[PDB]
Each structure stands twice: as structure tokens, then as C-alpha cells.
Structure 1
Amino acid sequence: ASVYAWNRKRISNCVADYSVLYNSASFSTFKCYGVSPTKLNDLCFTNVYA
């Protein structure tokens, strides 16, 4: 979607593996704020917005 019409996806109840994405050179930018980018798989939250 366009940046002004940014799309939002809701993520409830699904396991995800942020290690295969952090280890990928395809992503030109991977920067995290408030949570360490390395320690990401351990964290648990009730909902995720994308």
C-alpha cells in the first residue's frame, strides 16, 4: 500500500520465528526500538500490529 494509506494487519495467536528474518541480508534495514533485535523470540505479547 501507499505510505499515506498504510495497511494494518492484526496478528493474534500465531507462533513466529524472527530469527530467519533477522538473519536475512535481503532486508536492507532491520532496526528495533524498545526491544533488542537479537532477543526477540522470547518476548510474548497479546497482539501484534503490522
Structure 2
Amino acid sequence: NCVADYSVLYNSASFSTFKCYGVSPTKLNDLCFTNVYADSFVIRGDEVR
């Protein structure tokens, strides 16, 4: 139920990575999704791969 300007995330210098697996990230501002689901967690650095 919202509008997602992804550039707010994609231009952020905080991220150690911005990995994409079914899109290229600028297109997130053009697409439309039925839902998004954010799985969220904290993990050691040598297993973030």
C-alpha cells in the first residue's frame, strides 16, 4: 500500500553492499510489485557472502 522511491536507498553511502538478483537497482523506481517482503537480521561479516 505505498510508493517506493528506491533512489533513497540506492544513493545511501551507509550500505556495505547493494546486491540484486532479479532486477538491476535503478529499475526499482520504474517497476510495480504486488508485495515486498523484508527479511531482517544481524550476522558476522565472514558469512554475509
TM-score class, shorter:
0.5 to 0.7
Number of the residue aligned with 1:15: 3
Q: Distance in 1 between matches of 2:11 and 2:34?
A: 25
Q: What are the within-5 Å matches in structure 2 for residues 1-50 of structure 1?
A: 13-50=1-38
Higher helix share: 2
Higher strand share: 2
TM-score normalised by length of structure 2: 0.67
Q: Matched residues, percent identical?
A: 100
- Across the aligned residues of Structure 1 and Structure 2, the Cα RMSD in angstroms comes to 0.9
Q: Which has the higher contact order (CA 8 A, sep 6+)?
A: 1
TM-score normalised by length of structure 1: 0.66
CA drift of 1:37 comes to 1.0
Q: Show structure 2 runs of 5+ residues with no match.
A: 39-49
Alignment-mate amino acid for residue 23 of structure 1: N
